[PDB]
Amino acid sequence: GARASVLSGGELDKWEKIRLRPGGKKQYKLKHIVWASRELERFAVNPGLLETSEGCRQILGQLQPSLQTGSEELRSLYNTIAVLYCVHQRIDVKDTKEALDKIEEEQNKSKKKAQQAAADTGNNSQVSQNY
């Protein structure tokens, strides 16, 4: 498309502003987007639907667990998706780690919100012992 479907020209220019490594000299680009797209399509995921911050977040959440024991490439893909999502939400980034920490922080906060929320309006209990 004129300005792709995932990210527009400008969005792509910025998307290609994130570094792959903190001590490295790599950055995102249409190449990475194509790679991710290839993996997405190969994973049975729609690329266009990956344009929405929701779809990006969904994928990230889909690999979230796959990360537990995912591959190096799979992990890198997840990070890339996270960055994409950040751009979708209009989040500034510098490195893949930064974006990862950004999403990691947000997510963590989210989980908490869920906890504090439940607690606030809920309850829980437990027990365990043996002599």
From Swiss-Prot:
Region labeled Interaction with host AP3D1 — which residues?
A: 11-18
Q: Tell me which residues bear the N-myristoyl glycine lipid modification.
A: G1
State the post-translational modifications.
Tyrosine phosphorylated presumably in the virion by a host kinase. Phosphorylation is apparently not a major regulator of membrane association.
Q: What superkingdom does the record give?
A: Viruses
Q: Motif location (Nuclear export signal)?
A: 15-21
Q: What is the effect of changing S76A?
A: Loss of ability to fuse with target cell membranes and infect host cell
Q: Where is this region: Interaction with Gp41?
A: 6-30
Q: Where is this region: Disordered?
A: 105-127
Membrane topology, as annotated: Lipid-anchor
Outcome of mutating S8A: Loss of ability to fuse with target cell membranes and infect host cell
User: What does the record note on quaternary structure?
Assistant: Homotrimer; further assembles as hexamers of trimers. Interacts with gp41 (via C-terminus). Interacts with host CALM1; this interaction induces a conformational change in the Matrix protein, triggering exposure of the myristate group. Interacts with host AP3D1; this interaction allows the polyprotein trafficking to multivesicular bodies during virus assembly. Part of the pre-integration complex (PIC) which is composed of viral genome, matrix protein, Vpr and integrase.
Q: What is this protein called?
A: Matrix protein p17
Source organism per UniProt = Human immunodeficiency virus type 1 group M subtype B (isolate NY5) (HIV-1)
Query: Shown portion of the whole protein?
Result: 2 to 132 of 500
